[PDB]
Design an enzyme around this catalytic site. Sequence first.
Site, PDB file in Angstrom:
ATOM      1  N   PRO K   9     -41.648  -7.781  42.732  1.00 24.71           N
ATOM      2  CA  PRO K   9     -41.338  -7.883  41.321  1.00 24.71           C
ATOM      3  C   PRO K   9     -42.277  -8.826  40.604  1.00 24.71           C
ATOM      4  CG  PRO K   9     -39.647  -8.970  42.617  1.00 24.71           C
ATOM      5  CD  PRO K   9     -40.505  -8.167  43.570  1.00 24.71           C
ATOM      6  N   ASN K  10     -42.688  -8.376  39.426  1.00 28.45           N
ATOM      7  CA  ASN K  10     -43.537  -9.108  38.501  1.00 28.45           C
ATOM      8  C   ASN K  10     -45.013  -9.167  38.866  1.00 28.45           C
ATOM      9  OD1 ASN K  10     -41.415  -9.945  36.587  1.00 28.45           O
ATOM     10  ND2 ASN K  10     -40.634 -11.068  38.407  1.00 28.45           N
ATOM     11  N   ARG K  17     -50.186 -12.611  32.400  1.00 26.77           N
ATOM     12  CA  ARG K  17     -49.210 -13.635  32.036  1.00 26.77           C
ATOM     13  C   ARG K  17     -49.354 -14.881  32.905  1.00 26.77           C
ATOM     14  NH1 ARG K  17     -47.576 -12.949  26.945  1.00 26.77           N
ATOM     15  NH2 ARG K  17     -46.135 -11.190  26.594  1.00 26.77           N
ATOM     16  N   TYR K  22     -50.881 -18.593  37.848  1.00 27.02           N
ATOM     17  CA  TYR K  22     -51.159 -17.441  38.716  1.00 27.02           C
ATOM     18  C   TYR K  22     -52.579 -16.882  38.584  1.00 27.02           C
ATOM     19  CZ  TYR K  22     -46.121 -17.273  39.645  1.00 27.02           C
ATOM     20  OH  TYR K  22     -44.815 -17.559  40.022  1.00 27.02           O
ATOM     21  N   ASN K  76     -46.123  -9.214  49.515  1.00 29.63           N
ATOM     22  CA  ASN K  76     -45.758 -10.328  48.664  1.00 29.63           C
ATOM     23  C   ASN K  76     -44.478  -9.900  47.995  1.00 29.63           C
ATOM     24  OD1 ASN K  76     -45.323 -12.266  46.657  1.00 29.63           O
ATOM     25  ND2 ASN K  76     -47.513 -12.374  46.137  1.00 29.63           N
ATOM     26  N   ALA K  79     -40.147 -12.877  43.944  1.00 26.38           N
ATOM     27  CA  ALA K  79     -38.916 -13.630  43.914  1.00 26.38           C
ATOM     28  C   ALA K  79     -37.884 -13.136  44.942  1.00 26.38           C
ATOM     29  CB  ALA K  79     -38.326 -13.589  42.489  1.00 26.38           C
ATOM     30  N   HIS K  82     -36.918 -15.099  48.232  1.00 23.29           N
ATOM     31  CA  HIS K  82     -35.939 -16.178  48.302  1.00 23.29           C
ATOM     32  C   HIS K  82     -34.511 -15.666  48.331  1.00 23.29           C
ATOM     33  CE1 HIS K  82     -39.622 -18.002  47.121  1.00 23.29           C
ATOM     34  NE2 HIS K  82     -39.562 -17.455  45.917  1.00 23.29           N
ATOM     35  N   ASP K  89     -34.112  -7.919  56.588  1.00 19.35           N
ATOM     36  CA  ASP K  89     -33.618  -7.015  57.630  1.00 19.35           C
ATOM     37  C   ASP K  89     -34.554  -5.802  57.806  1.00 19.35           C
ATOM     38  OD1 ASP K  89     -31.500  -8.691  58.417  1.00 19.35           O
ATOM     39  OD2 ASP K  89     -29.961  -7.556  57.398  1.00 19.35           O
ATOM     40  N   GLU K 100     -46.563 -11.987  55.287  1.00 22.17           N
ATOM     41  CA  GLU K 100     -46.132 -12.343  53.938  1.00 22.17           C
ATOM     42  C   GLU K 100     -47.207 -13.176  53.291  1.00 22.17           C
ATOM     43  OE1 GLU K 100     -41.987 -12.867  52.804  1.00 22.17           O
ATOM     44  OE2 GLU K 100     -42.391 -14.936  52.271  1.00 22.17           O
ATOM     45  N   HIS K 102     -48.024 -15.295  49.591  1.00 23.22           N
ATOM     46  CA  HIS K 102     -47.716 -15.803  48.257  1.00 23.22           C
ATOM     47  C   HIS K 102     -48.963 -16.376  47.652  1.00 23.22           C
ATOM     48  CE1 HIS K 102     -43.497 -15.389  49.005  1.00 23.22           C
ATOM     49  NE2 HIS K 102     -43.721 -15.927  50.187  1.00 23.22           N
ATOM     50  N   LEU K 103     -49.142 -16.094  46.370  1.00 25.12           N
ATOM     51  CA  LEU K 103     -50.250 -16.653  45.594  1.00 25.12           C
ATOM     52  C   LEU K 103     -50.151 -18.164  45.535  1.00 25.12           C
ATOM     53  CD1 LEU K 103     -50.095 -14.111  42.648  1.00 25.12           C
ATOM     54  CD2 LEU K 103     -51.973 -14.231  44.308  1.00 25.12           C
ATOM     55  N   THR K 104     -48.941 -18.628  45.254  1.00 28.58           N
ATOM     56  CA  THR K 104     -48.652 -20.038  45.141  1.00 28.58           C
ATOM     57  C   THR K 104     -48.064 -20.619  46.416  1.00 28.58           C
ATOM     58  OG1 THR K 104     -46.415 -19.747  44.167  1.00 28.58           O
ATOM     59  CG2 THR K 104     -48.336 -19.835  42.641  1.00 28.58           C
ATOM     60  N   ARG K 109     -43.054 -26.042  44.791  1.00 25.99           N
ATOM     61  CA  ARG K 109     -42.498 -25.683  43.498  1.00 25.99           C
ATOM     62  C   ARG K 109     -41.001 -26.040  43.398  1.00 25.99           C
ATOM     63  NH1 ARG K 109     -44.571 -19.789  41.898  1.00 25.99           N
ATOM     64  NH2 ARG K 109     -43.637 -20.510  39.929  1.00 25.99           N
ATOM     65  N   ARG K 113     -37.337 -21.970  45.455  1.00 26.38           N
ATOM     66  CA  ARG K 113     -38.397 -21.146  46.058  1.00 26.38           C
ATOM     67  C   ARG K 113     -38.723 -21.481  47.491  1.00 26.38           C
ATOM     68  NH1 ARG K 113     -40.305 -18.201  41.507  1.00 26.38           N
ATOM     69  NH2 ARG K 113     -40.054 -19.550  39.674  1.00 26.38           N
TER      70      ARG K 113
HETATM   71  O1  LIG Z   1     -46.657 -17.136  44.397  1.00 28.72           O
HETATM   72  C1  LIG Z   1     -46.251 -15.972  44.605  1.00 28.72           C
HETATM   73  O2  LIG Z   1     -46.937 -15.053  45.055  1.00 28.72           O
HETATM   74  C2  LIG Z   1     -44.801 -15.585  44.314  1.00 28.72           C
HETATM   75  O3  LIG Z   1     -44.416 -14.682  45.383  1.00 28.72           O
HETATM   76  C3  LIG Z   1     -43.837 -16.786  44.376  1.00 28.72           C
HETATM   77  C4  LIG Z   1     -42.436 -16.336  43.891  1.00 28.72           C
HETATM   78  O4  LIG Z   1     -41.525 -17.447  43.980  1.00 28.72           O
HETATM   79  C5  LIG Z   1     -42.462 -15.921  42.428  1.00 28.72           C
HETATM   80  O5  LIG Z   1     -41.243 -15.291  41.964  1.00 28.72           O
HETATM   81  C6  LIG Z   1     -43.626 -15.043  42.103  1.00 28.72           C
HETATM   82  S1  LIG Z   1     -43.868 -14.176  40.697  1.00 28.72           S
HETATM   83  C7  LIG Z   1     -45.352 -13.606  41.127  1.00 28.72           C
HETATM   84  C8  LIG Z   1     -46.165 -12.687  40.216  1.00 28.72           C
HETATM   85  C9  LIG Z   1     -46.475 -13.460  38.920  1.00 28.72           C
HETATM   86  C10 LIG Z   1     -47.504 -12.771  38.010  1.00 28.72           C
HETATM   87  C11 LIG Z   1     -48.084 -13.643  36.892  1.00 28.72           C
HETATM   88  C12 LIG Z   1     -47.079 -12.565  36.558  1.00 28.72           C
HETATM   89  C13 LIG Z   1     -45.661 -14.074  42.351  1.00 28.72           C
HETATM   90  C14 LIG Z   1     -44.737 -14.875  42.933  1.00 28.72           C
HETATM   91  O1  LIG Z   2     -23.123  -5.359  60.851  1.00 30.67           O
HETATM   92  C1  LIG Z   2     -23.260  -4.729  59.780  1.00 30.67           C
HETATM   93  O2  LIG Z   2     -22.718  -3.655  59.515  1.00 30.67           O
HETATM   94  C2  LIG Z   2     -24.143  -5.276  58.658  1.00 30.67           C
HETATM   95  O3  LIG Z   2     -23.450  -4.954  57.423  1.00 30.67           O
HETATM   96  C3  LIG Z   2     -24.286  -6.810  58.703  1.00 30.67           C
HETATM   97  C4  LIG Z   2     -25.336  -7.251  57.652  1.00 30.67           C
HETATM   98  O4  LIG Z   2     -25.448  -8.686  57.668  1.00 30.67           O
HETATM   99  C5  LIG Z   2     -26.718  -6.711  57.989  1.00 30.67           C
HETATM  100  O5  LIG Z   2     -27.704  -6.904  56.945  1.00 30.67           O
HETATM  101  C6  LIG Z   2     -26.690  -5.270  58.382  1.00 30.67           C
HETATM  102  S1  LIG Z   2     -28.001  -4.255  58.569  1.00 30.67           S
HETATM  103  C7  LIG Z   2     -27.117  -2.961  59.074  1.00 30.67           C
HETATM  104  C8  LIG Z   2     -27.764  -1.623  59.430  1.00 30.67           C
HETATM  105  C9  LIG Z   2     -28.712  -1.858  60.621  1.00 30.67           C
HETATM  106  C10 LIG Z   2     -29.241  -0.566  61.266  1.00 30.67           C
HETATM  107  C11 LIG Z   2     -29.907  -0.737  62.635  1.00 30.67           C
HETATM  108  C12 LIG Z   2     -30.757  -0.468  61.415  1.00 30.67           C
HETATM  109  C13 LIG Z   2     -25.816  -3.304  59.095  1.00 30.67           C
HETATM  110  C14 LIG Z   2     -25.528  -4.574  58.720  1.00 30.67           C
END
Ligand SMILES: O=C(O)[C@@]1(O)C[C@@H](O)[C@H](O)c2sc(CCC3CC3)cc21
Ligand SMILES: O=C(O)[C@@]1(O)C[C@@H](O)[C@H](O)c2sc(CCC3CC3)cc21
Lengths: 150, 150, 150, 150, 150, 150, 150, 150, 150, 150, 150, 150
Positions: K9-10, K17, K22, K76, K79, K82, K89, K100, K102-104, K109, K113
């Site tokens: 997202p975003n 922006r 960023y 990435n 948000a 978090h 899962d 994973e 992250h830019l930041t 922060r 986060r």
């Molecule tokens: O630093 C990152 O890559 C983050 O994944 C950290 C996240 O905590 C945060 O929501 C956000 S929002 C974002 C895109 C912002 C873009 C300028 C519009 C990146 C991230």
């Molecule tokens: O025990 C459960 O039924 C839960 O609802 C517990 C949740 O904490 C969990 O995210 C998940 S993930 C999931 C499907 C996993 C399937 C093998 C790919 C079930 C559940």
Amino acid sequence: MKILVIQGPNLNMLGHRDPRLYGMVTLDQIHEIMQTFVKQGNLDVELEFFQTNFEGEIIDKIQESVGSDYEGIIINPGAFSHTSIAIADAIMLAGKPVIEVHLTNIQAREEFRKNSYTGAACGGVIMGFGPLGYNMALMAMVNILAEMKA
Amino acid sequence: MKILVIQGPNLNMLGHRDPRLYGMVTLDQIHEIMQTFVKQGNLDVELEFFQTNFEGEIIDKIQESVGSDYEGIIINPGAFSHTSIAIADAIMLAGKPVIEVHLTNIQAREEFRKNSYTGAACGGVIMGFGPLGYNMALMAMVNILAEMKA
Amino acid sequence: MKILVIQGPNLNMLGHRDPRLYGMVTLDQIHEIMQTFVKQGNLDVELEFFQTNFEGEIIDKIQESVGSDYEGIIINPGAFSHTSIAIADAIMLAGKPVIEVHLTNIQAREEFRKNSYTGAACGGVIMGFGPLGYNMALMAMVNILAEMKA
Amino acid sequence: MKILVIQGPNLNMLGHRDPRLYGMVTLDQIHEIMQTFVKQGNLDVELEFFQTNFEGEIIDKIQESVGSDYEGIIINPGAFSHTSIAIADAIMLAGKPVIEVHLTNIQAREEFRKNSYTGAACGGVIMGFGPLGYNMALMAMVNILAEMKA
Amino acid sequence: MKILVIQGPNLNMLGHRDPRLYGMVTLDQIHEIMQTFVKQGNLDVELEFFQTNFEGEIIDKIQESVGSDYEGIIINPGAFSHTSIAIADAIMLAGKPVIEVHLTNIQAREEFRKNSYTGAACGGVIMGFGPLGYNMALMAMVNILAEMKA
Amino acid sequence: MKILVIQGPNLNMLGHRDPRLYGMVTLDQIHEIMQTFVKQGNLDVELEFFQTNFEGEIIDKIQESVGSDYEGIIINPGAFSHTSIAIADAIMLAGKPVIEVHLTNIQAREEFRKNSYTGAACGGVIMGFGPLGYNMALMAMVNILAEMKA
Amino acid sequence: MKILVIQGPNLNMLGHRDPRLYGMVTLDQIHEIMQTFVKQGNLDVELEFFQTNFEGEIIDKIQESVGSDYEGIIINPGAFSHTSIAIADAIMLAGKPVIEVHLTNIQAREEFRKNSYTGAACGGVIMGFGPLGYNMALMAMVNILAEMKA
Amino acid sequence: MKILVIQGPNLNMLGHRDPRLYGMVTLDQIHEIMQTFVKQGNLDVELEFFQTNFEGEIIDKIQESVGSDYEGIIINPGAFSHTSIAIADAIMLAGKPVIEVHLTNIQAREEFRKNSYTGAACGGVIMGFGPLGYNMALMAMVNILAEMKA
Amino acid sequence: MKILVIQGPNLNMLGHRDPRLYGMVTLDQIHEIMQTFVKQGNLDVELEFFQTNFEGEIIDKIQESVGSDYEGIIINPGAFSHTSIAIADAIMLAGKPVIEVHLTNIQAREEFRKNSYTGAACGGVIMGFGPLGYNMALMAMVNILAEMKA
Amino acid sequence: MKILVIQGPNLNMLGHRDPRLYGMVTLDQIHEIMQTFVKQGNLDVELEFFQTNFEGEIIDKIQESVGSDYEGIIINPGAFSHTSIAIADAIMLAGKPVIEVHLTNIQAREEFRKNSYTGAACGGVIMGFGPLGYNMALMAMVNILAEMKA
Amino acid sequence: MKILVIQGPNLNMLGHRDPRLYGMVTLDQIHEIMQTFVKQGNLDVELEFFQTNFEGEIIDKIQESVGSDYEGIIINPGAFSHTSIAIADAIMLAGKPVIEVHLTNIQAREEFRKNSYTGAACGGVIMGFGPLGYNMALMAMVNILAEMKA
Amino acid sequence: MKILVIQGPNLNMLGHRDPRLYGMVTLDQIHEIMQTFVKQGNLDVELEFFQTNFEGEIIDKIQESVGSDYEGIIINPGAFSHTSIAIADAIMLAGKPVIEVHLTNIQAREEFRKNSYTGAACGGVIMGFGPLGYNMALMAMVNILAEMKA
Ligand SMILES: O=C(O)[C@@]1(O)C[C@@H](O)[C@H](O)c2sc(CCC3CC3)cc21
Ligand SMILES: O=C(O)[C@@]1(O)C[C@@H](O)[C@H](O)c2sc(CCC3CC3)cc21
Ligand SMILES: O=C(O)[C@@]1(O)C[C@@H](O)[C@H](O)c2sc(CCC3CC3)cc21
Ligand SMILES: O=C(O)[C@@]1(O)C[C@@H](O)[C@H](O)c2sc(CCC3CC3)cc21
Ligand SMILES: O=C(O)[C@@]1(O)C[C@@H](O)[C@H](O)c2sc(CCC3CC3)cc21
Ligand SMILES: O=C(O)[C@@]1(O)C[C@@H](O)[C@H](O)c2sc(CCC3CC3)cc21
Ligand SMILES: O=C(O)[C@@]1(O)C[C@@H](O)[C@H](O)c2sc(CCC3CC3)cc21
Ligand SMILES: O=C(O)[C@@]1(O)C[C@@H](O)[C@H](O)c2sc(CCC3CC3)cc21
Ligand SMILES: O=C(O)[C@@]1(O)C[C@@H](O)[C@H](O)c2sc(CCC3CC3)cc21
Ligand SMILES: O=C(O)[C@@]1(O)C[C@@H](O)[C@H](O)c2sc(CCC3CC3)cc21
Ligand SMILES: O=C(O)[C@@]1(O)C[C@@H](O)[C@H](O)c2sc(CCC3CC3)cc21
Ligand SMILES: O=C(O)[C@@]1(O)C[C@@H](O)[C@H](O)c2sc(CCC3CC3)cc21
């Protein structure tokens, strides 16, 4: 009176780094200012200055002070204030007056700076006056040690 | 068996400071008592004693023990028990039995003494018996090392 | 000396359940080992053993000990260690030495096992040595009671 | 009115242990004082006294009170105040007035004594008056039961 | 299959107290309904029912089940769900299927009911269906025990 | 004996607002009931009543009591119970018996009412009896002050 | 009765991923088992099955159920159980019986799985029985809807 | 320079109550000592002293200081240090140097004294030196105001 | 309608201090703007304005409003929002509509500003619109009071 | 001005479900009321209304608003207020005024509703006025956008 | 190797922006830079890029990757890092390497986060390098997938 | 460019202890791999390697880097990441790029490893790639230092 001035981690960088927050007066300059405070006051004080980035060297120094030589300590433990139970214990065990000084107001910064194990172990704490705090601590130590003699 | 006895920050002040809480028996006296426990028991044990106020010196010493020389450690990490993840990791990595001893009952003091990262890493923990704890630890280590040989 | 050995909830299943974690030595076997430790040591100790899954029976037993008969208690309160303020109070009120033993290292398990109300009330605590902990506790109790006589 | 007086774990040791904190008046003496308060007041009250170190016996007793015999309970659950949701539920389910008494001020001791599940379930709570608290509770119960009759 | 049905503190008051929250069906009625579920199903199940307000009696009963007699337990520990690490340990140690039932939805009440040490130890948990939960648990236990036989 | 009765913020609205929770008896009526309790008891007590919504006026009044005039205080600090360290300190410093009364059971309401800084500073606390609590406090104060004279 | 079965994020991977924890029975297989439970029971039930990884699609579906068509919901919200106040609100607002099912015992896993906003909103919760939980939920829903008709 | 010295709740009792903790020097005596410090130093300082138990009077006074009259404040807010966001805001808004003084070391007492909203708002904080702290604050204020003039 | 506008601690400094955060419009100017909003709207509203730095004066004023004179309150309690359970109780007890206004967005500042005891007691809360918030509150109050008349 | 009105999860059920808490006015009715507020005010405002149960659709819509078309947003994120850091970030990044509205007072409900990530990102927040809140937000937005033009 | 690059997202607003935080490089530009890194390296990599503001679309995409087509994911989650246990899962269940980015620096922060459910599920995490992080992740993924082939 | 590579407590045991978690590649081997990365890349980089178990030696080394010699640091502080505010401050004060590397994913281990004071002070953090992380850090540092030159 021999007064030991212990300066903790990073204090040796004072005046050279982050002047916005910690100012432009160096550690050596603070020490010369403290001497001048004693000399101009005609105080019967011998200052010993010690800086280190090592927790163990602070503890060794504090233990060194178990002696007829040193009568009190002024300490800025730096970041170890917030973390060092070991230094706090050494202070508790020193059996001589210890005063904690911080350049900054550690109530007004990050949450992780608010705890001071070492400060809790000290008789008193001075924070947020910059270098002047050390002269305040010197004033206070002289007065404490004179009270104890009486 | 070589058994390494590591004594942490402030332990060298034992018997000289805060006798109400930590007693009047010195660290050197505890070490002589441990020797006497081995000699009178005719135990096949060589004790090595090491005290330091430095976290890094404890870690260096523990790593030193990666060898055919030393077979177990008895450690009182002092205040580092509550703070030192680094020492806890060194203990985990030692791959030999480690026993933690505290003079005092760290469940019965300040809240900040209740956590022991190092104790969690040790096989066992003994607390609250004063100097006798070290002899208990010696008894235990001999029995553990004999069990491992069998 | 009469020494009361109190074993709490679930201890009667020792050696029969979860051998991986708690071992294969039964409670009865631990008690015979403790006797052998006394007999072979020619210690002037009479052991009384008591196991129960009832908090109230532990408290009744501890109160029973207010007498010229019993001079100390070695207790493993089991899970009640973490929950029983009532047993902790009974220990505080006993006015005789009490030593807490755990088979396992309760610093190294679930977060909910870290608190020991009962251990905080005891003079000392031993954990993580398995059955050997009880012999360590016996060694310690004899030494404590002899110190008190002197 | 039949009023049931339930005394919890360790209360039977009153007057015999820790007199500094809990005083020198025994449980039996408190019960005789309560009787004297009723007799001298010509109160139409029959007291029944019950002490136990067992949570289950307190719950059994409270349930026993579901009857035309007993009209209210005065309870000091001791340490179970802070731990026993089961006793708190029994109180909630009793459907008769219950008053909690503590000898000590449980707001002014260890943090772990501040929570009272049982007290939260009771109509009222009295703490910190020593034995006098039970007479206060008796005064209150008589007044409550008379109000309910009107 | 012998299936043991353990009912904890206060369950014996079901149908007689707080009908708004816990309903008007008594414990004895639930037990007759469970029997009818088995009889009408022609299930090869022998039910044994046990209610108690004592933690220690629950643990004793669970340990009793270490035998060729009983193959599973359905338990409603009542308020002990939230407090009893000892019962949770007994369940862990039972080495047979255990199912926890609550009449109410313990996720939807006071914060102090949300933790279930016992439920965490059980294979499965059923909550919020009133008396029907016990029949659900019976259905489940039969299916589990049949799966284990296959 | 002069006994000062201090009533805190909002108490002057008693009987006029939220009758469901706080009842229909006014503050003035409670004060007349307390007088009647003294007069009918022929107690040698002079009551002084003081209500205020100001923390500072409570502290001023408590300090006023440092004198041969007043021998004890009964206080309902209202919402300041939960917030006022300043009033708690004034109570600690008063050096005369202080009893805290609450109309309601502050263990059985919002989480934010459970803390009572003031109650922790008081000798005793009474809660959940409505207006009757003040008469209980009067009974108690007379008995305390008579004990102190003896 | 139309019963809507809603399966949340990741449930479509059942039987294909992490078989150790979630088993080898697929989602489609569970749905066929539920049908067989209805058909073999001659239950007057029409099942509708819906799986999605979108919170918004679950909410849309639940709102869709505001109608004469659907009489109850069986839901496994997956990970949204622990996070989705929005789904919890939709359940609260549905005004029809909703039962939450989890394959696993969410009391016995990571701390972050213990909270179930959705479960708190549901009439009942079933966890830890694997696929059988859905049949338990079906049994329960039929019984609930029949009770409501009576 | 006009320097305003604000003394908060309970400070007027200094020297008269709890001498063990707060000493035997009265507030009036501290104020005379501060005057003597100025007079003997020939400092160009006019002290104004103000004590109150009212939060609102402290705020009114601080706002009064928005003027050419007063150049700095030395404040001991007493217990309001830990509670008064309003006083902290007034300090922030004062736009003149403010120094916080505590007689005691508020890092070394109850947990509830560790937070100082007011101290966080002040330039600097001095604690644990008893009455001497006020002279330290005077020394510091003179030096700060002289630095600002330069 | 008489509408009482209560302005809490520090609000009288608006426009004179910290203009960056709180703007350059004074409190008196806001009050004239509110009047102009009523006059230009031909609203049948009489505004009464009251500012104070005293918690007790706010409570006294709110209680004053128990009368045929005043029909609603618009309040900015300033820092007391976060601390004053007493003011929150007064609001609860007022039995007339109360609207809370903050100039700033108290969700977007220090953690200690997020709690509003007073706001929780109010029907509605407006924050982050600066002075315009008071006109929004006026619009809202007129609409609420007109709805109540209908 | 184009003003976008975004309505989050479950808002489409307004007036149809839980009327006690959320009232009997539907979402469509609120939107017609907002139009009437603009038309009767002769405001130069074009309203666009958008409701969705999808977090991603809210974010897409907010991003859509990066344009000469839309000048501000009024948003009720529903339950996503408390959970959606993603929506909070979208609001922060929008670079146009955003006002948050809640029908209910989210300070006065469950603890889990008190946090509003989205509200913290908004310029202002309005809560607890029911449908009227949206007209308050409209009044405010017009005034903000006119201020920005000037 | 097919490597899937998922942007949450975003992220589509990057470069348009909040450039201070960023930067000024757009998402499309980052993707072209990643291609150039592969082409200039002659890496046997096919990149697929996917951005979305929908949690469910991320999960659908990750599940799509259960196939011979895709061998790893660089993600990435924005948000959702978090908040999204569901995405965490899906990552756990993917059974292919996930990195994973992250830019930041999300350790530096807001407190909210710091938690990354998704990062905990990933093999590795890269944060605080801006767009360069994606090339680091590409370098790493190629090396991981080559190690797995060997 | 001179790049300083600082390796913290226990890193010297890499490849020799706990190979399951930390692998079989030694620290010396990682350093040779980093050299090979520079040599094969023809990078204008001089690597200096430094390992220590002492916090103070890390701080001394970082301060040593205040010079024309060294242009950036790659650091794995080991367990000091989670504990050392002093090292975090040294990093903040270094005024040169610092990159933190962890072999393991510190988001996916014990709760006590999640906090990284040092990582929060660093420009970027890399975790969970084993030895490859150091080459990623080298790639990144070269790119950062080249960007700064431009
Ligand atoms: O630093 C990152 O890559 C983050 O994944 C950290 C996240 O905590 C945060 O929501 C956000 S929002 C974002 C895109 C912002 C873009 C300028 C519009 C990146 C991230
Ligand atoms: O025990 C459960 O039924 C839960 O609802 C517990 C949740 O904490 C969990 O995210 C998940 S993930 C999931 C499907 C996993 C399937 C093998 C790919 C079930 C559940
Ligand atoms: O304000 C103080 O005196 C502190 O003790 C507060 C501590 O929290 C902090 O770690 C540090 S670091 C430091 C020396 C910084 C110098 C410019 C290189 C002082 C302090
Ligand atoms: O009880 C113990 O053995 C402790 O390890 C507990 C730690 O919490 C504490 O820092 C200290 S300080 C210390 C030596 C004190 C000696 C008289 C100078 C021992 C200990
Ligand atoms: O390690 C110990 O000695 C403990 O006291 C730790 C407690 O936390 C725990 O409840 C239990 S349960 C138990 C007997 C288990 C036996 C094999 C059936 C001992 C203990
Ligand atoms: O003050 C009270 O009445 C308490 O209920 C407070 C509880 O916290 C405590 O466990 C105990 S223990 C006890 C009996 C102690 C007696 C001298 C042997 C009373 C109480
Ligand atoms: O819902 C349940 O089944 C509970 O296990 C939840 C527990 O939190 C609670 O203590 C109690 S008390 C109880 C019996 C109450 C009966 C009417 C007298 C059952 C339960
Ligand atoms: O129960 C009590 O006595 C309290 O001290 C508990 C406090 O938490 C509360 O603020 C209040 S408010 C109050 C007077 C309310 C009156 C009907 C207008 C009494 C109390
Ligand atoms: O140490 C200080 O200066 C304090 O500010 C610490 C505060 O926590 C406390 O409330 C109090 S009470 C007080 C005056 C006590 C006087 C002998 C009657 C001073 C203080
Ligand atoms: O934003 C608001 O309206 C607040 O109620 C938020 C409170 O947290 C704060 O204490 C304060 S202080 C204040 C007046 C400040 C004026 C320029 C001298 C208003 C407020
Ligand atoms: O008060 C509000 O406006 C809230 O934003 C508060 C949120 O906590 C809550 O999830 C919900 S649910 C909702 C629509 C409920 C409608 C009758 C079907 C509004 C809100
Ligand atoms: O993953 C990492 O790189 C860590 O920095 C994570 C830290 O939490 C941990 O103390 C340790 S210990 C360590 C060297 C272990 C080596 C095999 C002897 C590395 C690390």
